[PDB]
Amino acid sequence: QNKAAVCWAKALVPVLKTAGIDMTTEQWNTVDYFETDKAHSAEIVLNQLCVRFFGLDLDSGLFSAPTVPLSIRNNHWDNSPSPNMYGLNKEVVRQLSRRYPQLPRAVATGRVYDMNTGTLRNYDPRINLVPVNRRLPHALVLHHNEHPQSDFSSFVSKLKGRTVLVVGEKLSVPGKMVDWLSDRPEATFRARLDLGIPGDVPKYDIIFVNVRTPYKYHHYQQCEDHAIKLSMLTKKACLHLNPGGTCVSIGYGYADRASESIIGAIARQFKFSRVCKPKSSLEETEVLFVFIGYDRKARTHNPYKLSSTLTNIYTGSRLHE
Ligand code: NA
Centre of ligand 1 to C-alpha 206, Å, is 16
- Of 293, 273, 270, 286, the closest CA to residue 321 belongs to 286
Q: Can you say whether residue 36 is alpha, beta or left, with left for phi > 0 and alpha for psi between -120 and 50 degrees?
A: alpha
Please, what is the end-to-end C-alpha distance for the chain in angstroms?
A: 35
CA gap 301, 311 in Å, rounded = 18
CA gap 273, 267 in Å, rounded = 6
DSSP-derived secondary structure letter, 265? H
DSSP-derived secondary structure letter, 59? G
Q: Is 7 a catalytic residue?
A: yes
Alpha carbon distances (Å) from 13 to 39, 54, 268: 16, 17, 35
Q: Which segments of 144-299 are extended strands (E)?
A: 163-168, 177-182, 189-190, 204-210, 241-251, 270-276, 287-294
8 A C-beta contact, residue 95 and residue 65? no
**Catalytic residue chosen out of the listed positions 7, 144, 276, 301:** 7
Centre of ligand 1 to C-alpha 290, Å, is 15
Strand partners, 247: 207, 291
8 A C-beta contact, residue 321 and residue 277? yes
Which technique was the structure solved with, according to the deposited record?
X-ray
8 A C-beta contact, residue 225 and residue 215? no
8 A C-beta contact, residue 61 and residue 87? no
Backbone angles phi, psi at 144, to 5 degrees: -105, 140
Whole-angstrom Cα Rg for the chain: 20
8 A C-beta contact, residue 287 and residue 252? yes
Residues 6+ apart with CB under 8 A from 99: none
Q: 199 by DSSP, 3-state: which?
A: coil
Residues 6+ apart with CB under 8 A from 105: 111, 120
Q: Is 223 a catalytic residue?
A: no
Task: Establish how many alpha carbons lie within 13 A of residue 16's alpha carbon, considering only the half-sphere containing its beta carbon.
Answer: 26
For CA atoms 41, 42, 46, 52, the dihedral sign is positive
CA gap 22, 20 in Å, rounded = 7
Centre of ligand 1 to C-alpha 238, Å, is 10
Q: Can you say whether residue 94 is alpha, beta or left, with left for phi > 0 and alpha for psi between -120 and 50 degrees?
A: alpha
Alpha carbon distances (Å) from 136 to 132, 158, 318: 9, 33, 19
Q: Where are the alpha helices (DSSP H) in 3-41?
A: 8-17, 25-28
Determine the residue type at 150: S
Q: Where are the alpha helices (DSSP H) in 20-137?
A: 25-28, 42-54, 90-96, 103-109
What is the number of other CB atoms lying within 10 angstroms of the CB of residue 94?
A: 11
Q: Can you say whether residue 201 is alpha, beta or left, with left for phi > 0 and alpha for psi between -120 and 50 degrees?
A: beta
Residues whose CB is under 5 A from ligand 1 (ion)?
269, 296-297
Q: Domains in the chain, please, with CATH?
A: 1-133 (3.90.70.110), 134-321 (3.40.50.150)
